[PDB]
Design a protein around this ligand. Structure first.
Ligand SMILES: N[C@@H](Cc1c[nH]c[nH+]1)C(=O)O
Ligand SMILES: N[C@@H](Cc1c[nH]c[nH+]1)C(=O)O
Lengths: 415, 415
């Protein structure tokens, strides 16, 4: 029998073909981070399970890929990066210089009865003002633009949880139900409205409060939220500022207000946002927001404002494929060095060294094969040039070069 | 209280400082792979535990970080990449084109009562001749050279298991004890010779056979192995060819013969090799060899020759640090855009866009701060240029640029 060739249940293999696609995407994530002044970090995929106990009914924490070690504790393959980021920030001492702009491209994990995805994370730490969210949304737009998408293809929808926070506060509800409410109300587009209301009732919320919540989610303009919660309410000022700053940067066509956007995570406190395709065909492309309390929650002596997003590797690829923006780009190499026969191998190796020393990418024919088969290989591997190392030419201090009709060239002029 | 800021027991955090070091190393691994014509792949860190059942007493398999899922099976965080590579190769159909040269930089895991390391893997598939091992050893040398090491610092020791294979065969021992013998004999430098002999006796090996094994490991020349097993023995021809090919490529000073090198993995069948520091201060820098039977073992209908190495991220870094070849390279960015005050923020954002559109890396001051504090930040983040966006200049279609005494420059001439 054969060994099992399929990977573990919910997990992806990346042979070279699929890896090029992933690298194409990751190259954009690194390049955009660099363009925006963000610094790379990483942490272990294995974290203490205690890091993810939030008690808000979040899908992210419910679907934890956890297990017990033995000697150690209860651990989990990380379902997200943000708790790890906060751990690193706190573990950094007073030596953490603010503002800090950190990014990573972690694999994250889930379990249900797709268990693995990569997620670009970008976070700005120590910045109170909406300029953090502006920069983050602009980075997400820049990355999509770098991938060949335009504002005709995609948008980013923006809201502030401070609106719903006030509506909930003024209705007489305890603030400890706010996060679970956000979590439930996040389900609006996914489940029937009566079911959202049913779940809010199970939380103990009165029908008039539920209606207030319902209503605010469906207001189509910022001017309309200004009517409900006050024109100088801090969400109104912050959203106006957010839009005017994104407009000034030149991404006005990419962004829009949507009162129904809350996101599914407990810890967002301010502006929240979600990337979407304008044909309404795919799930969220990316999502994030401000989370000013999380570090306090983790034991920071002083509050540290934060905002950030995650941008998954799966939805974006489906969208780019639909838009024909991910053609296969076959493997290439600059040179294939071809020994005329095995006696020429030592000389061909010196030639291969010379080429690589000059910054070229180059293969040599490894097993014994005829020149015609060697040219076949050169075509297969996508060589720009074949360098044939034959006895006559070698005597003259030359090799034969064919751009892929073969011409003798002095060794020195190869590079 | 604070959340636990330390990572899970045997695992490393990579905040930006430490991440730069890792990126410096990984950049070399990618660059060397590219130079040598290797193609990147990846697979899930989670694999079926069945993939690693070899029954040879290997340290690698004994120290498995395994667990049971629930719905799924018995799984492990991969202790090595080679089984995953073989799975991918087999899962690729007749559509696998040979020879193939594939590389990856996986995190690998172990458990003992350091649990995590990254390991550059390079493997050549479908090549019978020693030219595979030549190319692989040259790649390891090229990577170390790229990191600033020379043949004065490091070497690669080379042997062939075919020598010990014959000695074991001629002594009348069953071939199913060969791998476990290799595994035990790998321990020679680590444990007393009598203990190696003790372990070989526990395997059921007779004292005269043990002595034959002992003796062959201590022969200092290939000419001496030629005396024992025959001058045209295939290990002798292959080692001679290996050395002459590495010499021709120009790395003769990096490589040497050592009859004691066997490596600790069950599946090596031919040439094996190990990178080492010439001061005798560190553990193996890298290690690999030919493994012609593994794919057959996994159910390949036809034999597929393979050779490859792993190159860890931990020993090399300790060595480079000792040699002062890993200085911190602080973060830099091309431009910091400084609004003169908050009213200038929209204009500063248009300027930031312009700079980034031109391929520059640039920050803007995010929170409100005084110009003097903004210059402090610019120094902190390692900006090459501060771009001050002030009212007077803006009116003239200009900004102020300071190389890090401030001069007015037309917007267009910024880039
Ligand atoms: N951790 C969030 C994304 C995020 C990063 N920073 C803030 N939010 C998620 O997984 O959706
Ligand atoms: N898997 C080996 C290295 C290797 C890669 N290819 C062949 N050997 C190890 O972990 O040491």
């Amino acid at each position: 029998n054969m060994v099992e060739t399929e990977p573990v249940q919910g997990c992806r293999d990346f042979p070279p073909e699929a890896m090029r696609c992933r690298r194409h995407l990751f190259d954009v994530f690194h390049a955009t981070a660099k363009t925006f002044g963000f610094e790379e970090y990483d942490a272990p995929v294995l974290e203490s399970e205690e890091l993810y106990i939030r008690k808000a009914g979040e899908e992210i924490t419910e679907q934890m890929f956890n297990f017990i070690t033995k000697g150690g504790h209860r651990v989990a393959l990380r379902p997200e990066m943000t708790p790890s980021l906060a751990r690193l920030l706190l573990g950094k001492g007073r030596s953490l210089l603010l503002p800090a702009k950190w990014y990573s491209i972690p694999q994250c994990w889930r379990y249900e009865a797709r268990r693995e995805h990569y997620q670009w994370n970008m976070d700005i730490v120590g910045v109170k003002s909406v300029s953090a969210e502006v920069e983050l949304v602009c980075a997400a737009c820049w990355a999509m633009r770098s991938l060949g998408l335009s504002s005709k293809d995609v948008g980013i929808k923006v809201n502030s949880r401070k609106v719903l926070q006030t509506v909930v506060e003024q209705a007489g509800v305890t603030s400890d139900k706010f996060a679970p409410v956000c979590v439930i109300v996040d389900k609006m587009e996914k489940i029937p409205r009566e079911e959202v209301e049913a779940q809010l009732a199970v939380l103990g919320l009165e029908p008039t409060v539920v209606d207030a919540i319902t209503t605010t989610l469906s207001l189509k303009s910022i001017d309309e939220i200004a009517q409900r919660v006050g024109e100088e309410h801090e969400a109104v000022k912050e959203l106006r500022q957010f839009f005017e700053q994104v407009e000034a940067y030149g991404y006005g066509d990419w962004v829009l207000f949507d009162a129904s956007v809350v996101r599914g995570l407990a810890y967002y406190t301010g502006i929240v946002f979600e990337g979407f395709d304008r044909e309404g065909k795919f799930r969220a492309l990316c999502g994030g927001g401000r989370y000013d309390n999380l570090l306090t929650t983790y034991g920071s002596p002083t509050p540290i404002p934060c905002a950030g997003f995650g941008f998954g590797d799966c939805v974006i690829v489906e969208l780019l494929q639909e838009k024909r923006l991910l053609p296969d780009i076959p493997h290439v190499v600059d040179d294939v060095v071809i020994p005329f026969d095995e006696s020429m191998r030592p000389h061909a190796l010196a030639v291969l060294r010379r080429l690589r020393d000059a910054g070229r990418s180059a293969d040599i024919i490894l097993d014994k094969k005829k020149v015609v088969q060697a040219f076949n290989y050169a075509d297969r591997v996508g060589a720009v040039r074949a360098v044939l190392v034959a006895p006559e030419e070698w005597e003259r201090g030359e090799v034969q070069v064919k751009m892929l009709r073969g011409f003798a060239v002095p060794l020195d002029r190869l590079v």
